[PDB]
Ligand binder design. Structure first.
Ligand SMILES: *[C@@H]1O[C@H](CO)[C@@H](O)[C@H](O)[C@H]1NC(C)=O
Lengths: 49, 40
């Protein structure tokens, strides 16, 4: 019955201050436009032009 | 950088491009090289 069946448990334990950050969530991307004043963001290089 | 003289370091200018980039994070104070190469 419920509460007695086997259960698969996985712990997502993470630590900090051991190495430079190297695990990051997915980063989305949008389409590329030209000849229009837009706000761009190339690898964190933000700017308008 | 190809050269023309097998003798000591030559005279010329050539910049080095980046090759490898790693986030190791580790603690370094000493480095050693590796060589792949009886006594008579
Ligand atoms: C070695 O770099 C480490 C961190 O990994 C730091 O704790 C330590 O200060 C460095 N070693 C010494 C003897 O200072």
């Amino acid at each position: 019955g419920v509460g007695y069946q086997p259960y698969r448990v996985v712990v997502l334990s993470f630590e900090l201050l051991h190495a430079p950050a190297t695990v990051c969530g997915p980063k989305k991307s949008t389409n590329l436009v030209k000849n229009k004043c837009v706000n761009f963001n190339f690898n964190g290089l933000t700017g308008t032009g | 950088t190809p050269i023309n003289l097998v003798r000591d370091l030559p005279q010329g200018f050539s910049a080095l491009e980046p090759l490898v980039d790693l986030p190791i994070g580790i603690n370094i104070t000493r480095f050693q090289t590796l060589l792949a190469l009886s006594s008579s």
